Amino acid sequence: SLAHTAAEYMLSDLKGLRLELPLDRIVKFVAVGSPLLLMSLAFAQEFSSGSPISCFSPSNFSIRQAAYVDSSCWDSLLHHKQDDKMKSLWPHKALPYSLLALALLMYLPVLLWQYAAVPALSSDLLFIISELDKSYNRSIRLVQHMLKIRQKSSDPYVFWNELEKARKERYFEFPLLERYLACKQRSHSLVATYLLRNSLLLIFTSATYLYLGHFHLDVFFQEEFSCSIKTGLLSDETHVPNLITCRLTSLSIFQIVSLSSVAIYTILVPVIIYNLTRLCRWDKRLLSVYEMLPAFDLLSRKMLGCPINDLNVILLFLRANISELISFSWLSVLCVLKDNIDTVVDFMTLLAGLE
């Protein structure tokens, strides 16, 4: 079948970065493979093939004449409906092609995301991850002489005033990363790609609904139609002027395909809606631990104004990559600290699991 090569040509499966969220991957997979799977199911060995159109020719007709009669009407599907208003049954002939066309349209947004946002996002993620990876040996290699002096001191002069200049010395501060984040916050060149990628899917789903409503849902319970042959050089002949009781064999496949196409997209729409709305708010589910690390406090510091910024998408893509191999470490281990108090445990946990 043709829908087999296209499957791995379209929907087939850096070096440490995930540039596609799992929900987006699932949405793309479903929205691309559903029409291909439906097309494969419709016209394969599962349902017996043969002649999609059959006609009840008179017994006087021969085999060749009957074949000509029933083959000159499949490419001219046009019901001479008396219920002389001639109605067309063309979707039955255009059901496969349209499906393939849909498989094209749902692949248009994906390429856009792979051609207008992947390189810049990859560069930003690489730079930010490289800068953040140096933040480990800066809270345990520098702030380590806090409890080493706390025991020979008291409350105010070792943990509420001493821990003020060590935090403001040229080992805790990252000015280049701060300025990079400040400059990227103003930019809006990447959120437009995300908005377009979701809006194109919404528009294509709406167009699919319109196509399935305007053209289908009319020829759906119609399985019989009457055609004519004497509309040309065969008019001057002695035979039936209007063919009688021609029946469509594959109406069940048509109905099943239409129902599945409706159901799949009516299920898929809310997921895309949620993906679009994910960028409408600032995320602070783990800001409590972020506001204490040397380099991670900058990310939580710059959360002001509207959330529609490049910084929002950068943070969203960085969160899914914060567990690669190196940040897949202590950062993922500060889950036991979930309820002054940070005098010991917050630092014994840090100095216990060094490496």
Within residues 220-249, the interface with its own copies by CB under 8 A covers 224, 226, 232-234, 244-245, 247, 249
Regarding 349 and contact with its own copies (CB under 8 A), the answer is yes
User: Residue 229 in 3-state DSSP?
Assistant: coil
The residue from 304, 306, 335, 341 that contacts its own copies (CB under 8 A) is 335
Would you count residue 352 as binding its own copies (CB under 8 A)?
A: yes
- Residues numbered 186-225 forming contacts with its own copies, rule: CB under 8 A: 224
Q: Which is nearer to its own copies, 75 or 164 (CB)?
A: 75
Which of 12, 62, 154, 340 is in the footprint of its own copies by CB under 8 A?
62
Q: Which is nearer to its own copies, 280 or 333 (CB)?
A: 333
**Which helix (DSSP H) or strand (DSSP E) does residue 66 occupy?**
helix 63-71
Residue from 126, 163, 267, 326 binding its own copies (CB under 8 A):
126
Binding segment (CB under 8 A) for its own copies, from list 93-101, 188-196, 281-289, 307-315? 93-101
Smaller CB distance to its own copies: residue 158 or 311? 311
| Other CB atoms within 10 A of residue 48 CB | 6
Q: What is the β-pairing status of strands 246-248 and 78-80?
A: unpaired
Nearer CB in complex with its own copies: 341/352:
352
Q: Which of 183, 192, 202, 273 binds its own copies (CB under 8 A)?
A: 183
Number of residues that bind its own copies (CB under 8 A): 75
Q: Is 67 in the site for its own copies (CB under 8 A)?
A: yes
In SS3 terms, 81-122 reads as CCCCCEEECCHHHHHHHHHHHHHHHCCHHHHHHHHHCHHHHH
State how far the Cα of 180 lies from the Cα of 127, in Å rounded to an integer: 10
Tokens of residue 320, six digits: 């899914």
Q: Pick the closer one to its own copies by CB: 59 or 154.
A: 59
Which helix (H) or strand (E) is 53 found in, with range? strand 53-55
Q: How far apart are CA 55 and CA 70, in angstroms?
A: 6
Binding of its own copies by 89 (CB under 8 A): no
How far apart (Å, rounded) are the C-alpha atoms in residues 4 and 6?
5
Letters for 17-56 (x = contact with its own copies by CB under 8 A, - = none) are -----x-----------------xx-xxxxxxxxxx-xxx
Q: Under the criterion CB under 8 A, does residue 341 sit at the interface with its own copies?
A: no
Q: With H, G, I as helix, E, B as strand and everything else as coil, classify residue 56.
A: coil
Which of positions 129-168 make contact with its own copies (CB under 8 A)?
A: 131
Output b/e per residue, 319-345; b: 16+ Cβ within 10 A.
eebeeeeebeebbeebeeeeeeeeeee
